[PDB]
Design a protein around this nucleic acid. Structure first.
Lengths: 64, 147, 201, 116
RNA sequence: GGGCCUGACUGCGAGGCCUGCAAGCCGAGCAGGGGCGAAAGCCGGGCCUAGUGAACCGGUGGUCCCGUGUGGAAGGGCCAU
RNA sequence: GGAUGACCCCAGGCGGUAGGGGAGCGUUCCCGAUGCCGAUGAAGGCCGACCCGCGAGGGCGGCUGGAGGUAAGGGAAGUGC
RNA sequence: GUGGAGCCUGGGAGUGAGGGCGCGAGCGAUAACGUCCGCGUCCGAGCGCGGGAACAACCGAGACCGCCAGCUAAGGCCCCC
RNA sequence: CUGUUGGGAAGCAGCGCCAGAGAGGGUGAAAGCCCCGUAGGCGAAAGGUGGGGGGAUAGGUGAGGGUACCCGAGUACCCCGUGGUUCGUGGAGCCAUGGGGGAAUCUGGGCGGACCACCGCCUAAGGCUAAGUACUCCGGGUGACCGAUAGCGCACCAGUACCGUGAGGGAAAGGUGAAAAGAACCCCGGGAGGGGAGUGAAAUAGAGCCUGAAACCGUGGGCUUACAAGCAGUCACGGCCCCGCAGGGGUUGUGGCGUGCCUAUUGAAGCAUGAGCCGGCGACUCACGGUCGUGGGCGAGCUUAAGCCGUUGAGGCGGAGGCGUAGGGAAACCGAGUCCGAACAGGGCGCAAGCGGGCCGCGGCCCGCAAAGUCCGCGGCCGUGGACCCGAAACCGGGC
RNA sequence: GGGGGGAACCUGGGGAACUGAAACAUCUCAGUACCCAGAGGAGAGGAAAGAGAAAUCGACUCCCUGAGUAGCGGCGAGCGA
């Protein structure tokens, strides 16, 4: 039977146009006073997942 | 050319890898599975599973709108096609005539887009980007805009 | 563009436009697909849960001094089921129409390239009877030294040719690379030759 | 379709069993037993092939050494003598000489005391 | 030790340290708007290396991005926490 | 070197478990088969100190056996203990 | 420095119980075929071959095949040998 | 039909013939033409069927005006408890309803995902309705299905023997030959068995019957062995036997060398596991997805699915649809860009197309070659299934 | 008229657990196994108090697609119009 897309992935990741896997930086969901504005500012950016693990997540999404 | 000639090219058909069938083979005994432990056993999802540690995926946080019941909202959708793709046509271009050509997918409102050379062509489209509009209204194209 | 020996009462006479080169692999890929889709796939076996025995533990897990077993349907038993034995499947798959199209094309092409192709206007005095067909085939260079795919929508001509061993008969909508490759000599109607070209348009 | 073992196994078994004719009791009767001896027979024939080359040389050297102490000197000296002489008749043939053609060997012994 | 001050900035961030991943760490520079200085200049917390907690689920503020026929609304999203 | 797997020359590599890869052998079955081998003997069996192959194997011969067998080239697996 | 070097991209792995020896330490008792690290090695996978009486890892030496040819390594050269 | 070899011809040979029939199977072996058939055709008084044909009957059919009589009740509706749906309390509608409350008859009511307002949709609380669908005890047809350890458990007198109080469990076991011609009669013998005779093409085809492997047991022959130390071998030499006439084969006296196989292990000859021996059975599969690779087809395109027609091992049609042609963003949106931002800084994620050769007055744009992509085949691997095979202790349901 | 039987197939009334979540209770296996009642050659469903956004469609069943989409979900495993 056909694979099911992992919804848990679908919902926190996007595969790019060139095939990289992009996600939100972790580290600012709370405990955020006392964090620099440098920290926060940067954690607001989408980043590219190391290749080893990008490939796995790419197989959870067979229909993107 | 009779039946005895019909033959597939080199490597068009290739042998299977039959394991567990004697020492000389390769490939014997353990059957390319090494010694002991689940993976050698008959039978866990390695795209996700990571050993009881919190997975690489489940530590990433969620983004944006997931949608809720009763689910997705019907709004119109726009597919772009590029001026360059409009190249092969003469006279008038519709969405209809774009689909039946395989450029504009069905149930998609048509939006002309920038990339390519404006052809002096009547192009009937649900939407035009800026540099698409200018380009056309400058090669003498006729940008009819419908709804 | 191939010059093909047509056969009319009003003289022999000769134009085709059929493929230049013959892909043997492509020819092969069609046959395979032809001989594969006609498979029955009625080979079956019984798994160990499909086998008529109980599922009672024949004897205790321990202390009998015998080995360990569950039920006797275990494939490890002579009573048992087979492990990865045939189940009815469907060997059919969908070969790209173009490939089919090119093979018919290339199959006929090859044959014509060998002056084994022969088109005919009609069929002299064949009105059903097998000897009637013999006659005609003799007069046409068809002695049964060579084997023939005889393609015509003419019911009566097929009936006459049918029971010959060295003849394989066929209505034109039935043309196909295998029945061509099987046979040494292709022999067709003008009326079949048309539908053939129409199939490859 | 099913490809029952059928003929194959018996044949691979006879092959081995024929190769095992001669062996004591089950080693020539039981296939498995046959295979296990043949493995051993295998390496032994290899190992002893290499070894046969050095079994004969030790013998030659014994045989020569004796013939050498008849004329009043030892194998080790004598051999040194040859090399100095520039005589390279292998000791297979040295041996033969010493036992078939005493005189020639006796010639060789003298060239050998000579070159010393 | 004192004077004034809030840069314990907001947008960013070339390039690196470290590193399996995820994180952790350093950061010159451009713009907004400031502080102190005559100025050169310095200031994106603390002489430095510990004082911490990934996601999920929720609360509050803002934003006004989606809003199930339409206008709203319910509810969510994004930014902050 | 020749002109593309044709062979020749020269040089170098060639212990090996997990394991990766590559080339083959043999079993059942299909196309080839309205064919070919077959009672002047199929399959199968028992021999062989003979031939070919590095090898798995394949021939050839003798005895048994008494009705089947199945090529070149391909196809598919209940495929080798 | 052209090596079964290297770098890049992808398919397939196995492995994640090591062990002995030399050396450097910690632990231990300046004990253990002990234990825990570091550099190296060899066994692992070279329980194939010579030496070491015997004997995975000490010495010698990385076994494609054949030879009733030759030089050697460690070790030896009274007889077993 | 005839000859011919043969126990037997259908083999081989000569000359013929039928074929809408050369599917298959029998007959002493290998048969279109001998037999049963096969192509093609014919057939029911009786019973069943009758969805096709016809006939009948039931039943059925308008327009305006006015009246406001009727339009399915413990219902709708609301609340409480639940179930159904993708919907797990969620913003939770809708559908069904155990509890409590409880309407109206078209200016009525339900719905369009809380609610409200618009705009729309539909008429609850009575019922019946073919066909297209599922299955396969039963009949038939066909297999890149099995071929007696296979295939159903059962080819055979099998759900039997047997086991269990019972539910229930559950086997093994097929073959003389073309024809019984099943071996009269005689001889040893109580019989069984055997020797002759006889039948047979064949009797180590004799019923304990085709082929008749191996373990295993005997007999006879050759070599060998009673001072010898062993994973049973190997190397060498020698003697004796054999085949032959510089060579082979068999054996083994002496000498050298030599720690079974598997498994598991840092490490096994190991006094660690497994194995009495032989034979047969026994374990990396398949489907649908996915990802590489690969052989091909076509390429800004590529491909159909279910179906339909045809075939009766013939393929064709079917463009619904899918994947690709554009990305960026949570999204509105914008778009070769886009997001963050006040930015027309900076940054994230994106965007550039081939290789020719020629005609022609620099590429105009051909033309080929290659490719994005995609479709099928193949193979490696991954997901989901029992997913390489065998094995629990146990859990749950219904019975005994 | 009923009663009983019928390999599966069907509807309804009831309805597990192993297992999956690498533990487990929500979740999963699953309205599956099974028990029961009824139907029949089929059964169920069936002429909109429907769908849901088209000025649309027009009974029901069944197949392909939609689509592993929308969503559901200790937003886990997974479930899935």
């Amino acid at each position: 039977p056909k694979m099911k897309t992992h919804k848990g992935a679908k919902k926190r990741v996007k595969i790019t146009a060139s095939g990289k896997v992009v996600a939100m930086k972790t580290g600012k969901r709370h405990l955020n006073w006392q964090k620099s504005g440098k920290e926060i500012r940067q954690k607001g950016r989408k980043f590219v997942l190391a290749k080893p693990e990008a490939e796995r997540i790419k197989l959870l999404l067979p229909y993107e | 050319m009779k039946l005895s000639d019909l033959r597939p090219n080199p490597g068009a058909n290739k042998r299977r890898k039959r394991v567990g069938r004697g020492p000389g083979s390769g490939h014997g005994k353990t059957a390319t599975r090494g010694h002991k432990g689940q993976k050698s056993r008959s039978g866990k999802d390695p795209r996700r599973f990571e050993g009881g540690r919190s997975t690489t995926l489940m530590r990433l946080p969620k983004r944006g709108m997931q949608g809720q019941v009763p689910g997705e909202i019907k709004r119109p959708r726009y597919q772009g096609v590029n001026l360059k793709d409009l190249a092969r046509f003469e006279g008038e271009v519709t969405p209809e005539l774009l689909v039946r050509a395989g450029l504009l997918k069905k149930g998609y409102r048509l939006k002309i887009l920038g990339e390519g050379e404006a052809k002096p062509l009547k192009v009937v489209a649900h939407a035009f980007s800026k540099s698409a509009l200018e380009k056309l209204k400058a090669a003498g194209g006729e940008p009819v805009l419908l709804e | 563009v191939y010059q093909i020996p047509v056969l009319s009462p009003s003289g022999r006479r000769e134009a085709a436009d059929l493929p230049a080169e013959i892909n043997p692999h492509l020819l092969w890929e069609v046959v395979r697909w032809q001989l594969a889709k006609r498979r029955r796939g009625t080979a079956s076996t019984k798994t160990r849960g499909e086998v008529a025995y109980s599922g009672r533990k024949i004897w205790p897990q321990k202390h009998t001094g015998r080995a360990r077993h569950g039920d006797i349907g275990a494939p490890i038993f002579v009573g048992g089921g087979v492990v990865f034995g045939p189940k009815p499947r469907d060997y059919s798959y969908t070969l790209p129409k173009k490939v089919r199209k090119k093979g018919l094309a290339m199959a006929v092409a090859d044959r014509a390239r060998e002056g084994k192709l022969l088109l005919v206007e009609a069929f002299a005095g064949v009105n059903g009877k097998t000897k009637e067909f013999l006659a005609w085939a003799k007069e046409a260079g068809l002695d049964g030294s060579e084997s023939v795919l005889l393609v015509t929508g003419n019911e009566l001509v097929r009936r006459a040719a049918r029971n010959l061993p060295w003849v394989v008969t066929l209505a034109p909508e039935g043309l196909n690379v295998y029945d061509i490759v099987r046979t040494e000599r292709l022999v067709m109607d003008l009326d079949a030759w048309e539908v053939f070209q129409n199939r490859i348009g | 379709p099913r490809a029952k073992t059928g003929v194959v196994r018996r044949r691979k078994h006879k092959k081995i069993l024929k190769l095992a004719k001669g062996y004591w009791g089950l080693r020539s009767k039981s296939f498995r037993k046959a295979r296990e001896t043949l493995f051993a027979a295998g390496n032994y024939a290899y190992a002893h092939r290499k070894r046969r080359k050095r079994d004969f040389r030790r013998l030659w050297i014994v045989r020569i050494n004796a013939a050498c102490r008849q004329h009043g000197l030892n194998y080790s000296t004598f051999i040194h003598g040859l090399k100095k002489a520039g005589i390279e008749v292998d000791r297979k043939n040295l041996a033969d000489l010493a036992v078939r053609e005493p005189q020639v060997f006796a010639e060789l012994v003298e060239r050998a005391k000579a070159a010393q």
